[PDB]
Enzyme design. Structure first.
Site, short mmCIF file in Angstrom:
data_model
loop_
_atom_site.label_atom_id
_atom_site.label_comp_id
_atom_site.label_asym_id
_atom_site.label_seq_id
_atom_site.Cartn_x
_atom_site.Cartn_y
_atom_site.Cartn_z
N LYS A 192 0.84 -1.19 0.00
CA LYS A 192 0.00 0.00 0.00
C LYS A 192 0.88 1.25 0.00
O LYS A 192 0.72 2.11 -0.86
CB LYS A 192 -0.97 -0.04 1.18
CG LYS A 192 -1.59 1.26 1.70
CD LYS A 192 -2.39 2.08 0.70
CE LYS A 192 -3.15 3.18 1.37
NZ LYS A 192 -2.36 3.92 2.36
N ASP A 251 -6.12 -0.62 -0.13
CA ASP A 251 -6.39 -0.95 1.27
C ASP A 251 -7.84 -1.41 1.38
O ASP A 251 -8.47 -1.70 0.37
CB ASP A 251 -6.04 0.23 2.17
CG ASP A 251 -6.79 1.52 1.89
OD1 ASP A 251 -7.61 1.53 0.95
OD2 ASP A 251 -6.52 2.52 2.59
CL1 LIG Z 1 -4.90 8.23 -3.98
C1 LIG Z 1 -4.59 8.58 -2.31
C2 LIG Z 1 -4.40 9.90 -1.94
C3 LIG Z 1 -4.15 10.21 -0.62
C4 LIG Z 1 -4.08 9.22 0.35
N1 LIG Z 1 -3.84 9.57 1.70
C5 LIG Z 1 -4.18 8.84 2.84
C6 LIG Z 1 -5.17 9.32 3.71
C7 LIG Z 1 -5.51 8.58 4.81
N2 LIG Z 1 -4.95 7.41 5.13
C8 LIG Z 1 -4.01 6.95 4.29
C9 LIG Z 1 -3.60 7.61 3.16
C10 LIG Z 1 -4.29 7.89 -0.02
C11 LIG Z 1 -4.53 7.58 -1.35
CL2 LIG Z 1 -4.78 5.92 -1.76
#
Ligand SMILES: Clc1ccc(Nc2ccncc2)cc1Cl
Ligand code: NI
Length: 315
Positions: free
Chosen positions: A239, A258
């Site tokens: 991840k 996730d």
């Molecule tokens: Cl595309 C994308 C953009 C921003 C995030 N930031 C996060 C926010 C909360 N917990 C984990 C990660 C995650 C993805 Cl998967």
């Protein structure tokens, strides 16, 4: 002493890059959880650090207004190279209107959702800043990560400038995070288990990989190599590796998977693991789901995901 600028306060010092609100919405991108170093200090005015420099950003319907604070000297308006930096950060070469159109054509769900959430693009982040930011992200929320990263930069990174009550620090170098009292100090700052992984990964990147130049290699390396490479690090799984690949290593096809994307996949796309039989998240099922979205959306799948992600934080 010196204070956070608004567009009205000091219109002299602002410069602009021509950028429609359809290509980029600051309010959806800077708090989207890609970077955790931007805050809306005054309404519609986003301040944060880039490299060893502070910026404040705001936009109209057709213009991206921006100014710099060097920190050390004559306060002036962004130079050309300084604006090339900003242009690159936002990867503005890439046409978002074209990508939305392409995705919408192959994905009717996307069509319905993207309408209300335009201008969601990916930032091109510094690998180091991205790596350690996303180590702090396991089992955590944007609010808490933002906090941890700020405290981490304050304690380990060089002071740049003070504006109002906020003291802006650069992001630490690897050496600074690799030291013996690094975990202990980080544990004091409330990272918990994540403190071990930060130190360990910094110590690893130096000794195992030969410093920050390693990360630049991964930027030119193919996606699959970079991902495998990243996954060797303490605290970095599929991840986190995919987040970094996508956000800092120019791999638009990387799709971080996730439980939250599982939910969206199943609810909104009716996806179930087909090659698999085990009915819940797994190393293989997650990768299967990653491939699913690449097939559907194409080589900017991660960017498409970012649109859905930004549309989920808003209810
Ligand atoms: Cl595309 C994308 C953009 C921003 C995030 N930031 C996060 C926010 C909360 N917990 C984990 C990660 C995650 C993805 Cl998967
Ligand atoms: Ni079902």
């Amino acid at each position: 002493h010196m204070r956070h600028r608004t567009l009205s306060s000091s219109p002299a010092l602002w410069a602009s890059i021509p950028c429609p609100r359809s290509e980029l919405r600051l309010d959806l991108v800077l708090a989207s959880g890609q970077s955790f170093r931007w805050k809306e200090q005054s309404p519609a005015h986003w301040s944060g650090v880039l490299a060893d420099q502070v910026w404040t950003l705001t936009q109209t319907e057709d213009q991206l207004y921006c100014t710099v604070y060097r920190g050390d000297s004559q306060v002036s308006r962004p130079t050309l190279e300084e604006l090339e930096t900003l242009h690159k950060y936002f990867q503005l070469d890439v046409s978002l209107a074209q990508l939305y159109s392409h995705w919408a054509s192959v994905d009717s769900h996307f069509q319905r959702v993207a309408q209300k959430f335009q201008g969601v693009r990916l930032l091109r982040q510094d690998p180091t800043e991205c790596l350690f930011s996303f180590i702090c992200s396991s089992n955590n929320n944007i609010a808490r990560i933002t906090g941890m990263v700020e405290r981490l930069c304050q304690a380990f990174g060089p002071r740049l400038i003070q504006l109002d009550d906020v003291t802006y620090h650069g992001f630490p170098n690897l050496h600074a995070l690799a030291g013996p009292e690094a975990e202990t100090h980080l544990r004091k700052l409330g990272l918990g288990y994540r403190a071990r992984y930060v130190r360990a990964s910094a110590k690893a990147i130096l000794e195992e990989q030969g410093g920050p130049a390693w990360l630049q290699q991964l930027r030119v390396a193919p996606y699959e190599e970079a991902h495998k490479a990243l996954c060797t690090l303490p605290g970095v799984g599929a991840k986190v590796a995919d987040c970094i690949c996508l956000m800092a290593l120019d791999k638009p096809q990387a799709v971080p998977v996730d439980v939250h994307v599982w939910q969206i996949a199943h609810r909104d796309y009716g996806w179930h693991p087909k090659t698999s039989q085990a009915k819940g998240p797994s190393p293989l099922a997650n990768k299967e789901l990653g491939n699913f979205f690449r097939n559907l959306w194409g080589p900017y799948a991660g960017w498409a995901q970012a649109v859905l992600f930004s549309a989920d934080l808003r209810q």
